[PDB]
Amino acid sequence: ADVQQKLAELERQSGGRLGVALINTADNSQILYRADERFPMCSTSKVMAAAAVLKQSETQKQLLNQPVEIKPADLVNYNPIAEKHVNGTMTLAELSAAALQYSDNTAMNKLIAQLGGPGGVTAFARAIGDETFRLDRTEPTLNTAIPGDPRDTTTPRAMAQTLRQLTLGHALGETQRAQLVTWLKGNTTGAASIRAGLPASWVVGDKTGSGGYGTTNDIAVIWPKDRAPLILVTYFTQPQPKAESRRDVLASAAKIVTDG
Amino acid sequence: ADVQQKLAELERQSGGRLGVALINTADNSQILYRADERFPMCSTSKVMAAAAVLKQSETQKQLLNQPVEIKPADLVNYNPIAEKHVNGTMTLAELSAAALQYSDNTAMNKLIAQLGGPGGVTAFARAIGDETFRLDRTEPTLNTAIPGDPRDTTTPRAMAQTLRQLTLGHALGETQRAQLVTWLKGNTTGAASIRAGLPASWVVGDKTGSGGYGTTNDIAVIWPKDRAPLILVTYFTQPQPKAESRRDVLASAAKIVTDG
Ligand SMILES: *C(=O)/C=C/N[C@@H](C(=O)O)C(C)(C)S(=O)O
C-alpha cells in the first residue's frame, strides 16, 4: 500500500537489504517485503535449536534437567552465562534460556551438540514443515553473513510461518509451546529492535541476532493490546564487511507495518 | 573535562535536562553531571521497593513465596504480568520480577503496599543511608514527572551510591544481593538505553523508567569486559508534558562517559 513505499524508502535510506514478513493471526493477512529472499539468521537460529530440544523432551521426559559439562575449551566469543559455570555444569533448560534470553553462544553450541550437529537442527526444521531453513555451522562461524552465501539462511516468510507454528500453532506439545513463549517473553536483548517500533502497551517475545556485514535481525511474536497476536520477522544486512548494527531499522520497519 | 563538555553538547542538542552519575569501582572515581539536581525517578524507583522486600525476606524467611491476591480493581495502566492473574495471585518473588524485568505497575503497587506505602519505601532508603530518595505516591501517578515537583525524585549521585550498595555492597544479605543482581540482569526493557551505548561484550543489569514530560531514565550496574564493575545513572526530562521519550540520549550519555 503505502507500506511498500515506506519499506522501500527505509531500505534505500539505510544502505542495506531489508526483509520483512508479518503474519496477522486475526485474519491470516500478511505484509511482505523481500519475503522470499534468503538472509543470514545469525542468532535468530537459536529459536529453531531450543525448539528442537523442546521437541526431544516430549519423548525424553527428563531431558531438560540433564546436566551438561561446560569446559574452558567450550567458551566461544560471547558467553555471559556459560562462563560462570566453566568446570561446572548447566542443565539443558538452563542452556536454552541462556541461548534464547542472553544469546549465549556457548549455550547454543551445547544445544547443537545435543541435536547431533547443525544437521539435527535442520532435521527438526524439516520435521515441522520448514523446507527453507538451513543450519550448516556452529557458533561463532554461523554468523559470517557473507553475501551470496546460502549457509545458515532462511527467508522472512518461512521463518514467520515457522515461528507461528512454534509459538501459537502445534509444532510443539502444549507444555513445550508454553515454555518457548515464556523464554522468548523474557529476552533481555530486544528493546531496541522490533519492540522499539511498537506501542508501549503491546507485549512481545522475540529473539535478536547479529553478525557480519552489519547483519541485524529480530523475530517476534506480538500480543497487541486488545488484538489477536502478530508474528513479525525483520531481517537486515549491509554491503560492508564491518558495517555497524542497525536495530533502529528494525524498529522503523515494525512501526511501519503495524500502523495500519 | 573532555567528558563534561561532551555531556553539555549532548544536553545542548537534546531539548531537555540530563543528569549523570558514574561510579567506577576500580578506583571509586566518579563522572558527575547535574548529579545533585533532582529528577523524577519514574520506574527506576522499583529497584528500591524490590530491594526493600528483599531486606524484609532476610527475617521473614519464606516471604518471597507469599501469595498476594490480584483483583480487577488493582490493575493500573500497564500490567503485562499482573493481568493474567486477576482473580488469582502472585508471589512476592513474582511481583518482584514483574516490577523489575517487565516494569509491571500493578506489581510495583503490591511491593509498595507490602512496605506500608510510599513512605515505607523511603524509610528503607533512609535505613541504608540514602537521605535523598523520596517515594510519595503509588503507580501510576508517581510518573507524572512535572518539572519542579519534588515528589518521587532523587538525584543521580544519591541513586548511583545507593545502587552500588544494594548490588555490590552489603546493604542486603548475600543471597538477597545475588537475587537482586540476577533480576536486574534479566531485565527485558533495557537494550535501547544505557546498554545501547556500551560495547556488546559488556554485561548489564538495569532498570529503565519513563513518564510525563518525556522523562526517560535508566540505572545500571555494568560488568565491562576485563574491568571492575561500574554503576551508572542517566536521567533525562523535557519541558513539554507530552514529549516523546529519548532513550537514544541515555545511550549517547553512556557512550560519552565510558569511552575513556
Ligand atoms: C547472534 O546473533 C550472535 C552473536 N554473536 C555476534 C554478535 O554480533 O554479537 C559475534 C560478532 C559476537 S560472533 O558471531 O559470535
Ligand SMILES: *C(=O)/C=C/N[C@@H](C(=O)O)C(C)(C)S(=O)O
Ligand atoms: C515506569 O517507569 C513506569 C512507566 N509508566 C508510564 C510510562 O511512561 O511508561 C506510563 C505512561 C505507562 S504510566 O504513567 O505509569
